[PDB]
Design a protein around this ligand. Structure first.
Ligand SMILES: O=C(O)CSc1ccc(Cl)cc1
Length: 282
């Protein structure tokens, strides 16, 4: 079916639950043996969220190559994304080591450092120009250059220095700051606007490494981000835009990382955003 009237009519019969469950029932299952080694326990935020062996990002080091991060590779759409958990205090250095090695241009953050009174991820970037951060274990330096604070998101300009070779690179930090503590946004407007600002920077482009995206666990809000972009990019690519099947796209993406889209509310928002962005950017 066209994705607009599946929506009008899921709300109507209201089977959002039902639909979301079939997706869970049909999603891929692949091994995660590396994530589950004892030696990595402390490297995972959540015990039920792990990267598949086949698609995990490997750090370049003899030590331990492990990070909770997955490469999502969309073939027809010609877009790749790295989805990862928000970093822990002990893993911050691994995170930036990963950004350096994969040659990413942008980092996209869909959550606040603190939500609902608990820590959602480490404060992993510097907040004042004159106070730079240094990751000792991976031998990197990170400096804040500038920042643009707008009402629904912020953009930061950062400098990452490989202290071993003295090479420097410019990283963009795209920080969506207003997703609610509970539930999903009510309108997708601002989310839509954020998404187009990321495209505009060149961060999602092939002339760079994959974009790094994350929230808490790296599956819920992060999955909405990548599903939406890919669905909107496919729409413009096909002779008939209406042929795009979002459930099909989501199940493809779940071949590369478990659990993408965590609630039916999030599934709904995804359709809603795609339906709306279709008719605008068109
Ligand atoms: O949770 C943190 O603070 C970082 S993860 C971690 C968990 C357990 C141990 Cl023993 C060390 C780090």
């Amino acid at each position: 079916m066209e994705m607009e009237k599946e929506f009008e009519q899921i709300d109507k019969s209201g089977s959002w639950a039902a639909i979301y469950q079939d997706i869970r029932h049909e999603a891929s299952d692949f091994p995660s043996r590396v994530a589950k080694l004892p030696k990595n326990k402390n490297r995972n935020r959540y015990r039920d969220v792990s990267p598949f062996d086949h698609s995990r990002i490997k750090l370049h080091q003899e030590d331990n190559d492990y990070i909770n991060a997955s490469l999502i590779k969309m073939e027809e759409a010609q877009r790749s994304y790295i989805l990862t958990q928000g970093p822990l205090p002990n893993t911050v250095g691994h995170f930036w080591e990963m950004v350096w090695e994969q040659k990413s241009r942008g980092v996209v953050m869909l959550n606040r450092v603190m939500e609902k009174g608990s820590l959602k991820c480490a404060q992993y970037w510097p907040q004042k120009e004159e106070k730079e951060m240094i990751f000792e274990d991976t031998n990197l330096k990170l400096t804040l250059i500038s920042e643009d604070i707008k009402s629904y998101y912020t953009v930061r300009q950062l400098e990452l220095e490989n202290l071993t070779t003295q090479e420097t690179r410019e990283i963009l930090h795209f920080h969506y700051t207003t997703w609610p503590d509970f539930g999903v946004p009510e309108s997708p407007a601002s989310f839509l606007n954020f998404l187009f600002k990321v495209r505009e920077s060149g961060s999602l482009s092939p002339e760079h490494g994959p974009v790094v995206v994350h929230c808490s666990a790296g599956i819920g809000r992060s999955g909405t981000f990548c599903l939406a972009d890919t669905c909107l990019l496919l729409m413009d690519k096909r002779k008939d835009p209406s042929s795009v099947d979002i459930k099909k796209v989501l199940l493809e993406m779940r071949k590369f990382r478990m659990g993408l889209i965590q609630t039916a509310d999030q599934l709904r928002f995804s359709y809603l955003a795609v339906i709306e962005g279709a008719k605008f950017i068109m």
